[PDB]
Design a protein around this ligand. Structure first.
Ligand SMILES: NC(=O)C1=CN([C@@H]2O[C@H](COP(=O)(O)OP(=O)(O)OC[C@H]3O[C@@H](n4cnc5c(N)ncnc54)[C@H](OP(=O)(O)O)[C@@H]3O)[C@@H](O)[C@H]2O)C=CC1
Length: 476
């Protein structure tokens, strides 16, 4: 129950139908002009009406947009809300190959709105960026990344953040009226999915307790690939896999066998009877991943991937983050997980496990780029399930003992927010509960809700935490 207590999941609950009147003040719609053709972008522009002012966000030029926005705000006076359709730009930015153009443009729009003093709440619309409601299909993991950024905008700029709304693929008049009614007043909700059945909103809940055996997890066997396998959590994952039956562990990281601690890790694993391969290669390098897969023993086919590669450093507040910082944070997450997905789809793996973060699940100030990068992982795991493929996303809280949060700097701030350091064995024992259940998505975190809830909600309420009774109690 100690391990059950670490597991949470995202659910979607029905909320009230909104009012029937459109907003009284003027809306400002923001369009990516090369990527304004999708049906849902037309349906949304039509629902906003012809009195809505339209801003075409061209390229990625913060100072140019700040100037253009300042002119609009001068001419129009205050807007009621800003409605961004930038998410429809899913093509990669030409200069930053791991950043979807719409993600870069949404960052620069949040930045330029603050620069210009346009204060109306920003709403970021997606289509297929969340899996909400029974049978729902997350069709665009790229747009799913924009939710990780948006939750961090709502932490950093709470007064000028509206929220996120996912649209259905057909935006009929019932969907349009939910939309415009939420923009009038959203009832204090800010992470919303419009579906045929109603409006759903995002919630964090404790996961159901483990059912010993219920997931038909197959025995660990053959070759298992742990990207980031020489790093802190990846090394501990590899040890556990060795103890459990893996014939062969393939560990990767940019430094490979030159990684800190690598020789000792190899010796620890080989003592347990496992074949060990340690390779040096960037998880975003598709050709190197293909070569690595082509090399596998005939008698030890790839049976599972654990994607632990990642960096969190050189992030910045939303107001300051650059596209080159965002690219570097996205590389081992979006680019590398897309390669892993595409080169293993046909292999019938037993597990495809992606390591996300609480930064992506609930949001962490100061970590927009890392939140977006991890949110892509969570969305890709739901998207793969829709294709009939296994996938799981595990959004860790804080690890103790090994890995990126052992820096007293990085450790001190997390623990002080109530995201407490987990013992490796407990974190791994909870991941094994998730994998035995074959759950698609979970956060695995030790929380002190009496510290977390009041800090997280100091400037704006969080409907997300209303389904965690300890958070409700802390706020009473
Ligand atoms: N520790 C924690 O509390 C949390 C961790 N996470 C996630 O867990 C995973 C592991 O974190 P952790 O073990 O703590 O961190 P570490 O820094 O210990 O390990 C991360 C590893 O990824 C490798 N790596 C980084 N970039 C690339 C890349 N482009 N290609 C291949 N390898 C790369 C690093 O090696 P190299 O530099 O040699 O490439 C290293 O092996 C990360 O994805 C992280 O985001 C999430 C929440 C909390």
């Amino acid at each position: 129950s100690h391990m059950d207590a670490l597991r949470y999941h995202i659910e979607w609950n029905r909320v009230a139908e909104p009012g029937t009147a459109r907003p009284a003040g003027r809306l400002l719609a923001v369009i990516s002009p090369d990527h304004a053709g999708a049906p849902w972008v037309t349906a949304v522009l039509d629902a906003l009406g012809p009195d809505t002012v339209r801003f075409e966000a061209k390229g990625t030029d913060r100072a140019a947009w700040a100037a253009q926005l300042a002119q609009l705000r001068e001419d129009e006076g205050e807007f009621h809300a800003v409605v961004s359709l930038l998410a429809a730009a899913e093509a990669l930015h030409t200069d930053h190959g791991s950043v979807p153009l719409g993600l870069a443009q949404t960052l620069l729009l949040a930045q330029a709105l603050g620069d210009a003093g346009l204060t109306a709440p920003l709403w970021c619309l997606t289509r297929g960026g969340v899996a909400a409601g029974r049978g729902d299909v997350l069709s665009s993991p790229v747009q799913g990344a924009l939710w990780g950024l948006g939750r961090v905008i709502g932490l950093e700029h709470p007064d000028r953040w509206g929220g996120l709304i996912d649209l259905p693929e057909t935006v009929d008049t019932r969907a349009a009226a939910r939309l415009t009614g939420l923009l009038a007043d959203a009832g204090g909700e800010d992470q919303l999915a419009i579906r045929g059945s109603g409006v759903l909103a995002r919630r964090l809940a404790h996961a159901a307790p483990a059912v010993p055996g219920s997931g038909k997890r197959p025995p660990v066997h053959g070759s298992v690939l742990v990207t980031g396998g020489t790093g802190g959590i990846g090394g501990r994952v590899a040890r556990r896999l060795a103890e459990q039956g893996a014939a062969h562990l393939v560990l990767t990281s940019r430094r490979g066998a030159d990684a800190p601690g690598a020789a000792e890790l190899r010796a620890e694993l080989e003592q347990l009877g496992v074949r060990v391969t340690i390779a040096a290669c960037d998880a975003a390098d598709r050709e190197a991943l293909a070569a690595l897969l082509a090399e596998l023993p005939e008698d030890a086919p790839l049976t599972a991937v654990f994607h632990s590669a990642g960096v969190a450093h050189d992030d910045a507040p939303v107001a300051d983050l650059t596209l080159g910082q965002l690219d570097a944070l996205m590389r081992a997450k979006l680019t590398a997980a897309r390669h892993l997905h595409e080169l293993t789809a046909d292999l019938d793996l037993d597990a495809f496990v992606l390591f996300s973060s609480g930064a992506a699940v609930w949001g962490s100030g100061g970590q927009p780029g890392y939140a977006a990068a991890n949110a892509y992982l969570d969305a890709l795991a739901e998207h793969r399930r829709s294709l009939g493929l296994t996938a799981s996303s595990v959004a860790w809280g804080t690890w103790g003992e090994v890995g990126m949060a052992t820096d007293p700097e990085v450790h001190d701030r997390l623990v002080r927010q109530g995201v407490l350091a987990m013992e490796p064995e407990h974190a791994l024992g909870a991941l094994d509960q998730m994998l035995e259940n074959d759950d698609t998505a979970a956060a695995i975190t030790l929380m002190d809700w009496e510290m977390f809830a009041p800090a997280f909600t100091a400037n704006r309420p969080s409907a997300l935490l209303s389904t965690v009774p300890e958070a409700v109690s802390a706020l009473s």
